[PDB]
Amino acid sequence: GVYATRSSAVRLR
Amino acid sequence: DTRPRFLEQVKHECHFFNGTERVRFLDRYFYHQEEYVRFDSDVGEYRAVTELGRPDAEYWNSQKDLLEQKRAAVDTYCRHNYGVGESFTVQRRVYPEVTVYPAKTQPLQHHNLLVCSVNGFYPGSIEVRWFRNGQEEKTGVVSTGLIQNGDWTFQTLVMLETVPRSGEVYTCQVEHPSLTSPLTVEWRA
Amino acid sequence: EEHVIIQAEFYLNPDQSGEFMFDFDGDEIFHVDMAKKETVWRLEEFGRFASFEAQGALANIAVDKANLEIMTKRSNYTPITNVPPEVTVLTNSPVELREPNVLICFIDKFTPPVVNVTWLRNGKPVTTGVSETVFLPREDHLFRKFHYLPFLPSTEDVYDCRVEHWGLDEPLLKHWEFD
Ligand SMILES: *[C@@H]1O[C@H](CO)[C@@H](O)[C@H](O)[C@H]1NC(C)=O
Ligand SMILES: *[C@@H]1O[C@H](CO)[C@@H](O)[C@H](O)[C@H]1NC(C)=O
Ligand SMILES: *[C@@H]1O[C@H](CO)[C@@H](O)[C@H](O)[C@H]1NC(C)=O
């Protein structure tokens, strides 16, 4: 199986 | 190099209870050691942990697509990855090697310490007990505690302070998920 | 809870160092070699059963870099406070003369994630056969790290793990010797 990546949210400005 | 440092951390955490029956997902953001904002699957939105994270909580919560990504994570991320790694993580089991040897509390003195060295086991949950002639000895027991080796194995030393007498038989007994019955090692003076 | 899986990431300025790894119950599943753009499994066996697209780690680190800039600015450029490590040296099994063993240097409870670590044999630096882990996350959001030195135990050799960290005034030496 393949490990999934949770993504990191981009902050404003 | 005395230049100031600045550190950002992110931890995406999946917490499992009863297999994958109950799952919690945490999307956690940190500045230095300070968690400033988090998504808790129990809530379904980001919440500021400190004053520093309020703008992020508000901005991210205004993005419905982002929130739905995070809300589905317990399934598409947590439960998925559990399935991927389960055979060699959740199901990983290695018995301990057990050795008993005498030692000294102080260098000059006769042997007054019995060491039960329990090495190479996984997972960390373990119970080690000392017996003197078939009776458990609960006094004078000191340990290193549980030591991680960093390579998916643990060890622990469990020591019994005692003055061995001729004829006495001491037994170290080890219980562990990898074992189907207690593992025992005897030591005679 | 029975188990916890954590995808832990960091980015550090001005060093421009970024790390990405997975943790299971306090042990490392894998990390991504950012320079090589490759997945490094902690145990080789892991990679026979699973795969990971290293590129996704790269994307996350890029976001973390951009996020750090913003946060640094937001905090009015408040820098990290150095927390010096606790260092412990032990062997992975009971020591017997001329029976192959491994020295472990455990570097724990520190931040930022930057350290210089040297193994010394009789006061001299040794590098043959040494290995090390990446920076591993703690629940208090400090870090820990392991360094390893395979060795042949003898009455003639003493060892030290020397750790340099910005939170230390001088390098920390933890000693090991036979019996
Ligand atoms: C755990 O999950 C199983 C179903 O997989 C269920 O039957 C059991 O009652 C659950 N609860 C526990 C053990 O607390
Ligand atoms: C940064 O400076 C601004 C302007 O004074 C202030 O509003 C804010 O509270 C400061 N943040 C910190 C944590 O120093
Ligand atoms: C590691 O060593 C180099 C030079 O030897 C130095 O510039 C750097 O600051 C050191 N890092 C730490 C954490 O001491």
Chart the SSEs and their pairings:
The complex is a heterotrimer of chains A (13), B (189) and C (179).
Chain A: no helix or strand
Chain B: E1 6-17, E2 22-31, E3 34-40, E4 45-48, H1 54-61, H2 64-71, H3 73-85, E5 97-103, E6 113-121, E7 127-132, E8 135-137, E9 141-143, E10 147-148, E11 154-161, E12 169-175, E13 183-188
Antiparallel strand pairs in B: 1-2, 2-3, 3-4, 5-6, 6-11, 7-8, 7-12, 9-11, 10-11, 12-13
Chain C: E1 3-13, E2 17-24, E3 27-33, E4 38-41, H1 46-49, H2 55-74, E5 86-91, E6 101-110, E7 116-121, E8 124-126, E9 131-132, E10 136-137, E11 143-151, E12 158-164, E13 172-177
Antiparallel strand pairs in C: 1-2, 2-3, 3-4, 5-6, 6-11, 7-8, 7-12, 9-11, 10-11, 12-13
The complex binds 2-acetamido-2-deoxy-beta-D-glucopyranose (3 copies).
One 2-acetamido-2-deoxy-beta-D-glucopyranose (NAG) binds next to loops of chain C.
Membrane topology (chain B): Single-pass type I membrane protein
Binding site for a peptide antigen (chain B): 56, 60, 80-81, 92
GO molecular function (chain B): CD4 receptor binding; MHC class II protein complex binding; MHC class II receptor activity; peptide antigen binding; polysaccharide binding; structural constituent of cytoskeleton; T cell receptor binding
